[PDB]
Amino acid sequence: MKAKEIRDLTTSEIEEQIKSSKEELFNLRFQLATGQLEETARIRTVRKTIARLKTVARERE
RNA sequence: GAUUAAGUUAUUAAGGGCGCACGGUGGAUGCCUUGGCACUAGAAGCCGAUGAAGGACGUUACUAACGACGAUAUGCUUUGGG
Protein backbone atom coordinates (compact mmCIF):
# COMPACT_ATOMS: atom_id res chain seq x y z
CA MET A 1 0.00 0.00 0.00
CA LYS A 2 1.59 3.34 0.96
CA ALA A 3 0.54 4.06 4.55
CA LYS A 4 3.69 3.08 6.44
CA GLU A 5 6.26 2.43 3.73
CA ILE A 6 6.52 6.17 4.32
CA ARG A 7 8.14 7.30 7.61
CA ASP A 8 11.44 7.05 5.71
CA LEU A 9 13.21 10.42 6.26
CA THR A 10 12.24 13.96 7.30
CA THR A 11 13.98 15.88 4.51
CA SER A 12 12.86 13.51 1.74
CA GLU A 13 9.20 14.25 2.46
CA ILE A 14 9.10 17.67 0.79
CA GLU A 15 11.62 16.64 -1.85
CA GLU A 16 9.14 13.94 -2.88
CA GLN A 17 6.10 16.10 -2.12
CA ILE A 18 7.29 18.50 -4.82
CA LYS A 19 8.26 15.59 -7.07
CA SER A 20 4.78 14.02 -7.38
CA SER A 21 2.55 17.09 -7.00
CA LYS A 22 4.42 19.30 -9.44
CA GLU A 23 5.92 16.81 -11.85
CA GLU A 24 3.40 13.98 -12.09
CA LEU A 25 -0.15 15.27 -11.60
CA PHE A 26 0.62 18.28 -13.81
CA ASN A 27 1.68 16.00 -16.64
CA LEU A 28 -1.36 13.77 -16.07
CA ARG A 29 -3.83 16.64 -16.43
CA PHE A 30 -2.32 18.21 -19.51
CA GLN A 31 -2.44 14.85 -21.28
CA LEU A 32 -6.11 14.50 -20.36
CA ALA A 33 -6.91 17.64 -22.39
CA THR A 34 -4.95 16.79 -25.55
CA GLY A 35 -6.37 13.25 -25.70
CA GLN A 36 -5.72 10.24 -23.47
CA LEU A 37 -8.10 7.65 -22.09
CA GLU A 38 -5.21 5.26 -21.49
CA GLU A 39 -4.67 5.62 -17.74
CA THR A 40 -7.42 7.76 -16.23
CA ALA A 41 -7.04 5.85 -12.98
CA ARG A 42 -3.56 7.18 -12.21
CA ILE A 43 -5.00 10.61 -11.40
CA ARG A 44 -6.79 9.28 -8.33
CA THR A 45 -3.76 7.39 -7.02
CA VAL A 46 -1.10 10.12 -7.40
CA ARG A 47 -3.51 12.44 -5.60
CA LYS A 48 -4.19 10.05 -2.71
CA THR A 49 -0.44 9.63 -2.24
CA ILE A 50 -0.13 13.36 -1.64
CA ALA A 51 -2.55 13.19 1.28
CA ARG A 52 -0.39 10.46 2.81
CA LEU A 53 2.72 12.62 2.41
CA LYS A 54 1.01 15.66 3.96
CA THR A 55 -0.31 13.67 6.91
CA VAL A 56 3.02 12.29 8.14
CA ALA A 57 4.58 15.77 8.36
CA ARG A 58 1.95 16.56 11.04
CA GLU A 59 3.26 13.69 13.16
CA ARG A 60 6.73 15.23 12.99
CA GLU A 61 4.82 18.49 13.73
C1' G B 1 -104.88 -3.66 -63.09
C1' A B 2 -107.35 0.49 -64.71
C1' U B 3 -110.53 1.71 -70.13
C1' U B 4 -112.85 6.31 -67.52
C1' A B 5 -114.70 8.33 -62.69
C1' A B 6 -115.58 7.59 -57.33
C1' G B 7 -113.26 6.19 -52.53
C1' U B 8 -109.50 4.28 -49.46
C1' U B 9 -104.54 2.56 -47.25
C1' A B 10 -99.33 2.48 -48.07
C1' U B 11 -93.32 2.79 -49.41
C1' U B 12 -89.76 7.08 -48.97
C1' A B 13 -85.42 9.10 -44.29
C1' A B 14 -81.42 14.66 -46.02
C1' G B 15 -81.77 13.71 -40.68
C1' G B 16 -83.78 12.95 -35.65
C1' G B 17 -85.98 9.51 -31.19
C1' C B 18 -85.85 4.81 -27.90
C1' G B 19 -83.19 -0.23 -27.01
C1' C B 20 -78.80 -3.23 -27.76
C1' A B 21 -73.73 -4.07 -29.29
C1' C B 22 -68.63 -2.17 -29.80
C1' G B 23 -64.60 1.82 -29.33
C1' G B 24 -61.88 6.47 -27.49
C1' U B 25 -60.93 10.38 -24.10
C1' G B 26 -61.35 10.94 -18.51
C1' G B 27 -58.62 9.03 -13.52
C1' A B 28 -63.79 7.94 -9.37
C1' U B 29 -63.82 3.45 -6.60
C1' G B 30 -60.88 -1.24 -4.84
C1' C B 31 -56.35 -3.17 -3.11
C1' C B 32 -51.04 -1.67 -1.33
C1' U B 33 -46.57 2.01 1.37
C1' U B 34 -41.61 4.75 1.15
C1' G B 35 -44.53 9.57 4.49
C1' G B 36 -47.23 11.58 8.49
C1' C B 37 -49.92 12.53 13.14
C1' A B 38 -50.84 11.40 18.44
C1' C B 39 -48.26 9.57 22.71
C1' U B 40 -45.44 5.97 26.90
C1' A B 41 -40.38 4.51 29.11
C1' G B 42 -34.67 5.67 29.34
C1' A B 43 -31.29 9.14 27.59
C1' A B 44 -30.47 14.70 26.69
C1' G B 45 -31.07 20.05 26.97
C1' C B 46 -26.33 23.84 24.61
C1' C B 47 -22.49 25.72 20.29
C1' G B 48 -19.50 30.87 19.52
C1' A B 49 -13.03 35.22 19.17
C1' U B 50 -9.09 28.23 19.37
C1' G B 51 -14.22 32.29 14.80
C1' A B 52 -20.63 29.82 15.79
C1' A B 53 -26.05 28.99 13.41
C1' G B 54 -26.93 29.46 8.49
C1' G B 55 -24.64 29.91 3.80
C1' A B 56 -22.20 31.32 -1.67
C1' C B 57 -18.23 29.13 -4.59
C1' G B 58 -15.74 24.51 -5.45
C1' U B 59 -14.44 18.83 -5.49
C1' U B 60 -15.48 12.33 -9.71
C1' A B 61 -12.39 9.84 -15.92
C1' C B 62 -16.72 12.27 -18.64
C1' U B 63 -20.97 16.25 -14.07
C1' A B 64 -27.05 19.43 -14.79
C1' A B 65 -29.21 18.86 -9.70
C1' C B 66 -29.54 16.64 -4.40
C1' G B 67 -25.99 13.55 -1.11
C1' A B 68 -21.38 13.40 1.81
C1' C B 69 -16.82 16.30 1.70
C1' G B 70 -12.90 21.31 1.67
C1' A B 71 -6.64 23.29 -2.51
C1' U B 72 -4.62 16.67 2.16
C1' A B 73 -11.47 18.21 -1.05
C1' U B 74 -16.71 11.72 -4.31
C1' G B 75 -11.53 11.74 0.93
C1' C B 76 -6.27 11.05 4.43
C1' U B 77 -3.99 8.66 9.25
C1' U B 78 -4.48 5.38 13.37
C1' U B 79 -6.81 1.97 17.31
C1' G B 80 -11.19 -2.29 17.36
C1' G B 81 -15.56 -5.00 14.98
C1' G B 82 -16.44 -7.52 10.42
Side-chain angles (χ1 to χ4, degrees):
Chain A
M1 201 174 179
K2 191 68 175 178
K4 63 188 294 183
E5 290 82 6
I6 56 190
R7 289 78 173 268
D8 51 356
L9 184 58
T10 303
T11 60
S12 296
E13 295 294 326
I14 303 180
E15 298 177 357
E16 187 175 357
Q17 180 67 45
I18 201 158
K19 181 174 69 68
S20 294
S21 175
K22 171 63 178 64
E23 299 180 357
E24 298 298 326
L25 188 59
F26 180 78
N27 290 316
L28 293 174
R29 294 187 297 184
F30 275 4
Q31 292 177 354
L32 184 59
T34 61
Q36 177 190 3
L37 191 62
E38 292 187 354
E39 52 181 4
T40 55
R42 296 290 184 269
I43 302 173
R44 190 176 183 273
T45 61
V46 300
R47 189 176 67 188
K48 303 297 186 293
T49 60
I50 288 179
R52 296 182 182 95
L53 294 175
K54 287 185 178 179
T55 310
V56 176
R58 303 295 293 167
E59 300 183 0
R60 297 176 186 268
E61 305 156 43

